Each structure stands twice: as structure tokens, then as C-alpha cells.
Design a binder for this molecule. Structure first.
Ligand SMILES: O[C@@H]1[C@@H](O)[C@H](O[C@@H]2CO[C@@H](O[C@@H]3CO[C@@H](O[C@@H]4CO[C@H](F)[C@H](O)[C@H]4O)[C@H](O)[C@H]3O)[C@H](O)[C@H]2O)OC[C@H]1O
Length: 330
């Protein structure tokens, strides 16, 4: 209640504090957001499928509500996300006869979408995840396969950044990805961003999703990743932080509540993480959780459909967890 510290105040001098929302959860969690965050991200309603579900049909209504909420409460907004292998409708890659479109056609659709979306929120949204998760998560290759990449070629990302920059040259443009602290994938992300910067491409930041577990990645791997990326001269945002109660191999569905030890280790893990972020306050400018309280989290159904997870600083009744007290006292 009254005597609880406010996350954004606690970290006033370190970084912004954000949360991913939709219009429902804005209503359901309004007070937590008003009390703690100074930054908002749309969990789903600014991805391609929720902005242009059919060609020439733009559905900005839900995204507008999110932006209106943020502006009415002095909160910044991160835009998420323009170009991604997921949650993009099929029409984008097809012609009238069901076949794939050409390089030049896909570029015009990319440019048209990026221009329409970014111009609408120009001067309200201060940064954009332009490219999401383009690096390969496994294997020897640099890049994931995607229809973006297959149709256009490997320079589809340079084009995306240049289209966004032209639509709003005052925005900070980000490459955004997960498993960003595993060394092999860290070096791919580093190598990709380095090459883009070395060509003069307007990429200003790296977004570290940080969909983490109690164990992985280690504090040393997080520190190395921060330093490797920060050495490129880019801004760093932590963009989707949560601390899952299950490791990747742990696919149990029948846990009705977190254990005493899970709750305690999570508190400790969050304390170590925010200590590391504070230490690197000079390169980390924002820390956004993918949610805010345990009554809404995508981890309830990912990677295991139909279970429950407890990944955030507040519980389902919106009360501070022990993780809260450790996080604010670094
Ligand atoms: O409602 C959900 C919505 O919340 C969700 O948003 C995206 C979630 O995060 C990002 O996408 C996922 C990142 O994590 C990957 O999974 C990893 C698999 O490999 C590891 F082992 C690791 O432990 C996992 O974290 C997923 O494959 C990605 O899709 C995006 O940036 C968000 O937009 O997604 C859509 C809605 O259903």
C-alpha cells in the first residue's frame, strides 16, 4: 500500500521501469502500472497481425488505447515490433495466385507498413524494435530462416532499419532477441549488429529480452553479454524480463503453487540481476518486464500450454513478492 517503494522512483537514476500490457490488463492491473512503471510496451497489439491484418486494412484501435493510457500517465512507450518471423499474416508474402511475391514487392509492403505505423505514433513512441529474433537460436548459421529473408535476401534487415529511420529519424531503433546471453548466440548477435553499424545502418540499440530461468543464464554470462554488446557503442534495453520457475527441461503441468525454495531462489535471483543492472547503469537505459504481476503472464501457456507460472515481482493478488524486496534494495 502507501508505504511500498515505487519501482520507477527506486531506479530513477539508473533506468526506466516498464511493463508489457494490452487493453484488458491495463484495466485489470491499472494501479500497479500507475504506481510503479514509467514505460509501456504492447504485448501483442503492435505486431503486424494486429495492425494490418489485411492489405490496406489498418486496425489501430487497441494500440491507440495503450498509447493513450501511457501518455495520460507520463509513461514512455516502446514500439514492438515491425519485422518478425512470427505473428505476420500470410498476405504479406503472397500475390493473388498464392505464390510468393518478389524482392521489390515485399520491400514496398515492408516500407508501406513501417511508414504508416511509425508515422502515426511519431513523437509519442520513442523507440522501436525494428527487427525481432532474426538470428538463429540453434545450429551453425547466423540467421534464422523466414519469408522476409527468403524473399528479400539477407539485407532485408538493413532495409527495415532505413525505412524506420526515414519514417521517424528521432526514434531509437533496436535489434531485439532472446537467449541473448548464451555465448554462441551472443557472438552471432554481436557479429550481426557490428556488421550493420559498420555499414552505417541506423541501429541505435540492442534489446535484451531476458526470458530467464532461476539458473540460466549465469550472472557471468549476463555480465559478458552486457559488456560485449555495450562495446559496440549501442544503447541497451532489457525488453521482456521474466524469471520462470521452470527450467527448459522442466515441463511439469501439475504444480499448483511455487515451492518455498522456488520463491526464495527467485527472490535471490532477482536481487542478483538488478544488482548487475545497477552496476551497468551507464549502458542500460530501460528495464521492461513482460507483464507486471503473476495474474497475467504468457509463461502460463509457454512453453507448456495450460499450466501456471509465477515469474514477476507481484503475486496474483498484486502484493509484493519476496523478489520485490530484494530487487528494490540493491
Ligand atoms: O501472448 C504472447 C506474447 O506475450 C508473446 O510475446 C512474445 C514473447 O517473447 C518473445 O518471443 C519468444 C521469446 O522466447 C522464445 O522461446 C525460447 C525458446 O528457447 C529457450 F530455451 C527459451 O527458454 C525460450 O524463452 C519464443 O520462441 C519466442 O517466440 C517476443 O519478443 C514477444 O513478442 O508471444 C505471442 C503471444 O502468444
Amino acid at each position: 500500500n502507501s508505504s511500498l517503494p515505487s519501482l520507477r522512483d527506486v531506479f530513477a537514476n539508473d533506468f526506466r521501469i516498464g511493463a508489457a500490457v494490452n487493453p484488458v490488463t491495463i484495466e485489470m492491473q491499472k494501479q500497479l502500472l500507475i504506481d510503479h512503471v514509467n514505460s509501456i510496451t504492447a504485448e501483442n497489439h503492435m505486431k503486424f497481425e494486429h495492425l494490418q491484418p489485411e492489405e490496406g486494412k489498418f486496425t489501430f484501435q487497441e494500440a491507440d488505447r495503450i498509447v493513450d493510457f501511457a501518455c495520460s500517465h507520463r509513461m514512455a512507450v516502446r514500439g514492438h515490433t515491425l519485422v518478425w518471423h512470427n505473428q505476420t499474416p500470410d498476405w504479406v508474402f503472397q500475390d493473388g495466385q498464392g505464390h510468393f511475391v518478389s524482392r521489390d514487392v515485399l520491400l514496398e509492403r515492408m516500407k508501406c507498413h513501417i511508414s504508416t505505423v511509425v508515422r502515426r505514433y511519431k513523437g509519442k513512441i520513442y523507440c522501436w524494435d525494428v527487427i525481432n529474433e532474426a538470428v538463429a537460436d540453434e545450429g551453425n548459421e547466423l540467421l534464422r530462416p523466414s519469408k522476409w529473408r527468403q524473399i528479400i535476401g539477407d539485407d532485408f534487415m538493413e532495409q527495415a532499419f532505413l525505412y524506420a529511420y526515414e519514417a521517424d529519424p528521432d526514434a531509437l531503433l533496436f535489434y531485439n532477441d532472446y537467449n541473448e546471453c548464451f555465448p554462441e548466440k551472443r557472438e552471432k548477435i554481436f557479429a550481426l549488429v557490428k556488421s550493420l553499424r559498420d555499414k552505417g545502418i541506423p541501429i541505435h540499440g540492442i534489446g535484451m529480452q531476458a526470458h530467464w530461468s532461476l539458473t540460466r543464464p549465469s550472472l557471468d554470462e549476463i555480465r559478458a553479454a552486457i559488456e560485449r554488446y555495450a562495446s559496440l557503442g549501442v544503447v541497451l534495453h532489457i525488453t521482456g524480463l521474466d524469471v520462470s520457475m521452470f527450467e527448459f527441461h522442466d515441463r511439469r503441468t501439475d504444480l499448483a503453487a511455487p515451492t518455498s525454495e522456488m520463491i526464495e531462489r527467485q527472490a535471490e535471483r532477482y536481487g542478483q540481476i538488478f544488482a548487475l543492472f545497477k552496476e551497468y547503469r551507464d549502458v542500460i537505459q530501460s528495464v521492461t518486464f513482460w507483464g507486471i504481476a503473476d495474474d497475467h503472464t504468457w509463461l502460463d501457456n509457454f512453453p507448456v500450454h495450460g499450466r501456471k507460472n509465477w515469474p514477476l515481482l507481484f503475486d496474483e493478488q498484486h502484493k509484493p513478492k519476496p523478489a520485490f524486496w530484494r530487487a528494490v534494495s540493491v
